[PDB]
Design a protein around this ligand. Structure first.
Ligand SMILES: CC(C)n1nc(-c2ccc3oc(N)nc3c2)c2c(N)nc(N)nc21
Length: 910
């Protein structure tokens, strides 16, 4: 009753729009989504209440683990004969006195085995229990749990110690793991009971194939089409029928009419049989203007665009009158139509509005059931008669050359052109294609989607199609694959094989491809919502990725409604998310004042204003005692205003410092430092840092310890976000305060026997960033955007642009003599040294490794075409990595290409 109203106010604060605004949406799909999605909410809540309190603690503090338990050979070599030295802390009695217990145990020990050994070492002091029964009431390993010292990360599940990311990181970085022994009931009491209630809104024919007609759509008239009548002569509505991004028939234009009276009243006839309309078929249209002329070819220009699903969410072929409010053209539309554009009516009703009428067949026309589709596919099945079409092959028509040809085709990258010969070939051998499952994306593109006979047969292949790798399945969720049977199969592969580690890794892409879904309620959204509601680490980022796009009206409805369903069932975390949302709001409003009102003032004056505004009661309270949106395991305690400052970077970002209120903060970090940036789109850096992380993981598995630094970056809104401060790091320019300056600095920071490890870490990190930046075509490097850690770890910051941002393949990271001197340990002939030869071998090995995983990187960029990133608008942008990775060329030709690009950039050496 009263509790619903309170919850509605909390959800409203979280999503940035009131819940009541969803209640007033008349669209039945919106109301059905809101109602129907609640079953995912029920399901998720039940799984959390299954084995309470542990199942609830597993939701709140899920194990931060690697996908595979298996440790690479060079990582195992860092261990002392397969054993790890672990420190276990116990907070005991008054004065909260900390007591450490250092243990030497097998890397694959279960946390309960780790707890047992710690209590044995604690008990060892009492030499009485030591001899007779060392157990001490079965060491009550079930009465305690291990927590990471300095952050809210627990070891609640039976995994091997080394599989937990904190431990693997400790091994790799040569750091001592510090864990805190905590009583189970101390954590369980912190965990509040989940009181999920259903909202008040929870309470509230002929077949397509029996229509022997071609498709017709009526264009009536347009309103709100205001244009300079002195400039423009006439206007017209351009239309087309599409399956995803590809047309199913030729485009049909209306008659040209003067803009003073846009009233066509024309029935446009399409070259498509109504039964041949695929499930995902859409009407794509646009209002264009035509003028000119100068005696030269006419001047066409799109004014506004709009896309419609030819079938509604209930499988009903759209009928009757319909009005579509159009969208404004985005810069760089290489056609008069925008089929990759969002399907639907513009929420702003004071925009061009085209009135349409569809056909009516004296009955509700519905898309056929799978029983009708199966029967038709089975029905669609002499020796020489198969020879009449290159698109069909009979019983035993699979040669050994053709089998190897299909294998060769499946290897090729997603951006590789499949010829029409290859499309007929793939389709004719579709039944053999089942034996090579990974070929599915190629075979699907070979289908004639404007043929019900082919599509029905393809549907039966997809039904009994063997599972493919999650990474291979993700391609099938991009814009190229609109069919629900194909997309449904892809979601089913992720449900079965995607680990929560990998889901967290690829969550940005999965959130993006939701935008390519025809309907609000689909298999993908249900999959992602259930995962977000059964894992709070996933849920946190699911919330922020959706919230960061709420300002974009192309996705605000879908994302708003999805966020509402999330908030209604996430539990206690809503209260915590709201603290973060308010904290961000105060930082946005404060930085907005500094960019608008106080921009033309000195740092002393600006800082005076910052300090005064921060010390305000409402501000102080809002901005302290919340969880870092960058990593919600990090508690941000009280602000250290003396350590906070306005940065000298443009867009004047705030450098913020909070106390870490963890009892063992000293063993991780006492102060949490974050850069709040207002002015830059953080999405490009977010995707680059994700790719860097993936590249590093590839190299590590292959046995190349090339340490990268994919620091934390999170977009929280329209050109607003957070950036992780890398501790003990400085830019090359701030080091230079000659060529030996950098090497001399690292020598002083790493004196004695540690020197050789610092040079090694420098060379290795340098090699990783050299390869990564060249492949990705990152923005040009310089002394202010290259940083070095005290230990010697080199890394880059502020990516900004990737791929061909110039608009012939650049080398962003040119190694000056400064870097080569450090590499060669202070040598005269920097080129001809064993240290440089070692360094080159690292770059070559790293280059080829990424070449082998090319399909993943192409696919991660492809799924990202949905977001409005300026340098990632078409598949031609993505094609830059086809060039840098030299995919058309051979492996030896690729090394020669890489060597030549490095040779030309550095003026010799390679
Ligand atoms: C002091 C300054 C040179 N700086 N800038 C950044 C940074 C600031 C803004 C950024 O924007 C992007 N995209 N990467 C960025 C990196 C950064 C950082 N992360 N860590 C440390 N210790 N110092 C940093």
């Amino acid at each position: 009753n009263r509790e619903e109203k309170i919850l509605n106010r909390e959800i409203g604060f979280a999503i940035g729009m009131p819940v009541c605004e969803f209640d007033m949406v008349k669209d039945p799909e919106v109301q059905d989504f809101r109602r129907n999605i609640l079953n995912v909410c029920k399901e998720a809540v039940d799984l959390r209440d299954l084995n309470s309190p542990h199942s609830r603690a597993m939701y709140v503090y899920p194990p931060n683990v690697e996908s595979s338990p298996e440790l690479p050979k060079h990582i195992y070599n860092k261990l002392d004969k397969g054993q790890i030295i672990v420190v276990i802390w116990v907070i005991v009695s008054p004065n909260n006195d900390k007591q450490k217990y250092t243990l030497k145990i097998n890397h694959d020990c279960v946390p309960e085995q780790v707890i047992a050994e710690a209590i044995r070492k604690k008990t060892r002091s009492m030499l009485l229990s030591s001899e007779q029964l060392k157990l001490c009431v079965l060491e009550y390993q079930g009465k305690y749990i291990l927590k990471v010292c300095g952050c809210d990360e627990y070891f609640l599940e039976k995994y091997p110690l080394s599989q937990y990311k904190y431990i693997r990181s400790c091994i790799m970085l040569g750091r001592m793991p510090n864990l805190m022994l905590m009583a189970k009931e101390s954590l369980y009491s912190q965990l509040p009971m989940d009181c999920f209630t259903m909202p008040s809104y929870s309470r509230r024919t002929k077949s397509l194939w029996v229509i022997n007609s071609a498709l017709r759509i009526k264009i009536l008239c347009a309103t709100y089409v205001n244009v300079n009548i002195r400039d423009i002569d006439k206007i017209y509505v351009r239309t087309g029928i599409y399956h995803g991004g590809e047309p199913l028939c030729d485009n049909v234009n209306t008659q040209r009419v003067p803009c003073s009276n846009p009233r066509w009243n024309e029935w446009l006839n399409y070259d498509i049989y109504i039964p041949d309309l695929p499930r995902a078929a859409r009407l794509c249209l646009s209002i264009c203007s035509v003028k000119g002329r100068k005696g030269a070819k006419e001047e066409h220009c799109p004014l506004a665009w709009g896309n419609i699903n030819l079938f509604d969410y209930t499988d009903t072929l759209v009928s009757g009158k319909m009005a579509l409010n159009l969208w404004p053209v985005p810069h760089g539309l290489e056609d008069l139509l925008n089929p990759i554009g969002v399907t639907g009516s513009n929420p702003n009703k004071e925009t061009p509005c085209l009135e349409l009428e569809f056909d009516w067949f004296s009955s509700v026309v519905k898309f056929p059931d799978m029983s009708v589709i199966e029967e038709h596919a089975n029905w669609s099945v002499s020796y020489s008669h198969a020879g009449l079409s290159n698109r069909l092959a009979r019983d035993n028509e699979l040669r050994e050359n053709d089998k190897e040809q299909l294998k060769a085709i499946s290897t090729r990258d997603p951006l590789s052109e499949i010829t029409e010969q290859e499309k007929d070939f793939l389709w004719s051998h579709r039944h053999y294609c089942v034996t090579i499952p990974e070929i599915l994306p190629k075979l699907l593109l070979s289908v004639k989607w404007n043929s019900r006979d082919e599509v029905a047969q393809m549907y039966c292949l997809v039904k009994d199609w063997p599972p493919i790798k999650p990474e291979q399945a993700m391609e099938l969720l991009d814009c190229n694959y609109p069919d629900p049977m194909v997309r449904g199969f892809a979601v089913r592969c992720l449900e079965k094989y995607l680990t929560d580690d990998k889901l967290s890794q690829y969550l940005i892409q999965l959130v993006q491809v939701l935008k390519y879904e025809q309907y609000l309620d689909n298999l993908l959204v249900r999959f992602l919502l259930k995962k977000a509601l059964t894992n709070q680490r996933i849920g946190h980022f699911f919330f922020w990725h959706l919230k960061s796009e709420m300002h974009n009206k192309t996705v605000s409805q879908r994302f708003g409604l999805l966020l509402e369903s999330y908030c209604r069932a996430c539990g206690m975390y809503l209260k915590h998310l709201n603290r973060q949302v308010e904290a961000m709001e105060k930082l946005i409003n404060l930085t907005d004042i500094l960019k608008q009102e106080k921009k033309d003032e000195t740092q002393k004056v600006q800082m005076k204003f910052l300090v005064e505004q921060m010390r305000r009661p409402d501000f102080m309270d809002a901005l302290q005692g919340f969880l870092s949106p960058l990593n919600p395991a990090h508690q941000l305690g009280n602000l250290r205003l003396e350590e906070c400052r306005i940065m000298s970077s443009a867009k004047r970002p705030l450098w913020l410092n909070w106390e870490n209120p963890d009892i063992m903060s000293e063993l991780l970090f006492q102060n949490n430092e974050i850069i709040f940036k207002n002015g830059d789109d953080l999405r490009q850096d977010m995707l680059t840092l994700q790719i860097i992380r993936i590249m590093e993981n590839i190299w590590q598995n292959q046995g190349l310890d090339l340490r990268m630094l994919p620091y934390g970056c999170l977009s929280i809104g329209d050109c607003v976000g957070l950036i992780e401060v890398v501790r003990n790091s400085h830019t090359i320019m701030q080091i230079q305060c000659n060529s030996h300056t950098l090497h001399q600095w690292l020598k002083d920071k790493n004196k004695g026997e540690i020197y050789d490890a610092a040079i090694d870490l420098f060379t290795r990190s340098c090699a990783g960033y050299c390869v990564a930046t060249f492949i990705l075509g990152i923005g040009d490097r310089h002394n202010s955007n290259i940083m070095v850690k005290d230990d010697g770890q080199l890394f880059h910051i502020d990516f900004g642009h990737f791929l061909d941002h110039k608009k012939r393949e650049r080398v962003p990271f040119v190694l000056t003599q400064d870097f080569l001197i450090v590499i060669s340990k202070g040598a005269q002939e920097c080129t001809k040294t064993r240290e440089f030869e070692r360094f080159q071998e690292m770059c070559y090995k790293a280059y080829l490794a990424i070449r082998q995983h090319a399909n993943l990187f192409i696919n991660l960029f492809s799924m990202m075409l949905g977001s409005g990133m300026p340098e990632l608008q078409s598949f031609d942008d993505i094609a830059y990595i086809r060039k840098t990775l030299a995919l058309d060329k051979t492996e030896q030709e690729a090394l020669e290409y890489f060597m030549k690009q490095m040779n030309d950039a550095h003026h010799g050496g390679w």
